[PDB]
Amino acid sequence: DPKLNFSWPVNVGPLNPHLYSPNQMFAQNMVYEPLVHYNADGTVGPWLAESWEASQDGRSYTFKLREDVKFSNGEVFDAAAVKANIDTVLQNRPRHNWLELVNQMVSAEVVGPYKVRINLKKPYYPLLQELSLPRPFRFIAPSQFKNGGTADGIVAPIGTGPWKLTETKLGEHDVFTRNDSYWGPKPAYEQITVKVIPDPNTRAIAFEAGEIDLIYGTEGPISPDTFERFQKMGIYNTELSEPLETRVLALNTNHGATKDLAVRKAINHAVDKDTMIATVLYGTQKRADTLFADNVPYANIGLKPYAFDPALAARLLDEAGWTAKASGDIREKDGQPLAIELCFIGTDAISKSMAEIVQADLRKVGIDVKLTGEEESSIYARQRDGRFDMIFNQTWGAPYDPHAFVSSMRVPSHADYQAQLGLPDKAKIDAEIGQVLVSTDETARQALYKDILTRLHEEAVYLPLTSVTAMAVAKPEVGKITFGAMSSEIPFEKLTPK
Template identity: 65%
Template sequence: MSFFRHASALLLCASFAAWAALPTLTTAWPVNVGPLNPHLYTPNQMFAQSMVYEPLVKYQADGSVKPWLATHWTHSEDGKTWVFTLRDGVLFSNGEPFNAQAAAENFRAVLENRQRHAWLELVNQITDVKALSPSQLQITLKSAYYPFLQELSLPRPFRFIAPSQFKNQQTMNGIIAPIGTGPWVLQESRLNQYDVMVRNERYWGEKPAIGKIVIKVIPDATSRAVAFETGDIDLLYGNEGLLTLDTFARFSHNPAWRTQLSAPVETVMLALNSTRAPTSEQAVREALNYAVDKKTLIDGALYGTQQVADTLFAPTVPYASVGLQPRSYSPDRARALLENAGWTLPAGKTIREKAGQPLHIELAFIGTDALSKSMAEIIQANLRQVGVEVALVGEEESSIYARQRDGRFGMIFNRSWGAPYDPHAFMSSMRVPSHADYKAQRGLADKAIIDREIGEVLTTRDEHARQALYRDILTRLHNDAVYLPISYVSTMVVAKPELGVIPFAPIASEIPFDQIAPEAAQ
């Protein structure tokens, strides 16, 4: 097992770097971690960005935040001006000091690329950031903004890279090297092969028990499973696309391995494009919702590991329990909706037509995501039963994200972002063309109202008004049938038992490698 390889290093190579005498953990991911620019998105992988870069405040499982790079903070009575006192003695992994000036430079770099980050309302709210002293950072907002601290804790974009690694005093066009304050340092990256993280020996906090993490690039879920079974990797941690769930179920019955499922963390759904025919029709979108047998899909493709989703967010998400009426599986109701909308079934045909045009919809998904492919095939079969022809479009991750941004889809797999993004940050992003939601909603008659109310819900200081606004927004989106919720998903873990119990991170997109304590290291 790879995390026992440290024994000889400990005895024979004492002069190695400190991490060489510690356990090595090998895991797998579908793609490389990317250049690890803390202020940008794809192809940067969020779990790896969070390993290298840290926030001012750290999100907790109960929804609160705790001091991190900032030890405490105060704010003005009107909630617009905040002063953060920074932790003493923090260094970037290259030895540069982390101080208020470095923090302010990072905020400047993010805000100079404000349009790219406009999905996050905090970016729009910040009017000024300045260093008051080496240890005090002041942030000024347009208005009081209730998710302020939670959004500072996100994996991106408000995390900190050494200013010496900016390119031309900016980060929007790339960085020199990924130098952060976090517990890990990117040591090596080989395209389509692997990435290597090593422990940051300058880390200000408790250092990880693991010295080195090898992240093998294995795009295929079956190959990842084989790599685990043969001992090539020690841990698989991620969402339901990481392994086929029949494999997860099989592993869970093998006492030689440890398997874990978290509580539900996100919603998997289809976004239905309201600007492109035929999903531009309300009746078609409603019919699609009634036509998918979610329970059978979950019991079959998902091996019962997830819960049926009736709404955009689970009722346990803050502000999301608003009593919406589920659209339960009813193919007869789906057929009736389509008939009444003029989509009829010509004699001898299995696909409905209207004005000579077949009821044809493309469903786009990430081709390397085994589970998305299985789910897409089941949905395709369900919809054919009511006379809808679905063409499956499986492409690489970056291509699917491009489709989400530019609206080249009829239906496309989408998911909420989990804590701490849901509901506020996920809904904030609906107002800009950075994700599938904006393009899916753009053709709705009440899109302008939805966008206005999202802006209001983020800035009101009246809790009752906030609840009422969330209720109206969620009701409108539900009534518009612009989403087809499928399941509330959990994080999966498959691990060698010697790694001990694997903790789940409060933020769904993070992997808490720094908290894993192999028995060999204890």
């Protein structure tokens, strides 16, 4: 059976299901599995739990587990194993409390041999999405606990997944073997070797020499340069996923010229995102016309894009009192120039190149963008103070969207809060956000998000720029790449070599 060589900058880690770095999320996803599965269209479906019910008040969920699942060592996957895992996570609460699902979780109880009930302090509809995460709610054989838990180490990384970790060589590789007693469909590949290649130039050469078959990742492991270099050779398979998270400029409704709706709309009409993507990103990301893409839960609401239309942008400006003396002039309104400050982290090359593109494009319609590249700490001070006209931001990505990012909009010291402060409907928006997070009603939930996202779009609070995507470069014999529904999901089990 066929074997795959995969490159990664680092070793996969010890693969503890309940800890973070140095454990790599994609590798945790190969070995361990969640109760429920996040789909690429934003829905959540059955996985280790075949069924579930939420109590009427939304504070308890009872999961009915599959009855045909074994851990890779042959031990039973059941309600007892799930509770044992949940409990060791909750006993290490300080590590995990950043996740609002954990923060609201009171307890787990065994209510049948294959039924587990999860209890919350208050309703929290994103429970299902956050259960689909690579960590911390995936399941190791409890026999692998050390001293009654996982927080201080595990015996061996024994999961229920389609892959088993069978060899680790630090600085060299990690080898995963197909789990031939996996409960689901069996992988076409018998073996996945993760080769440790931290140096991008070495990775390129290794891919040339045929020492690795697949490269896969987002902005992190793969530069636009790297993807461009391979896609132009025209002999490999190169593909991009569906949108994962959105990069935006937040425009400050409470500060400067961006207080004016016409100016914010003009900005949305005057940046050529397609050219920005083509030049700065080498086509490795997709144009975003809305804050959230239509594969984000509750966000498929048919918002109309602001089309690239610099003449219209000029008409919106002039028709708001921001007029140009002559053709190429910086516009003015009551003595004052149309100058706006765009603040970004000065050592971030991509953001910097994007900011320079924004500056050039907006200058064409009479806007003087001042570029203020500064250190991260200085940028966080600006976000919280509202001392910006435009500032870069990013959504959280699947499966955290839209709830995580929207939730932060109503919290002071977040960029989005400061940027939205000038909206007359800010208090109402913040009330709807509070209501949507505790909503137990799916119809109400869609209506609430529709209203929130529609107001943010129509009031042009954002300049949505790009959708980050997973990139894949593969030898043609690997076949079509099936992309994960979240950035940390690399579906080796779905590869079918030709």
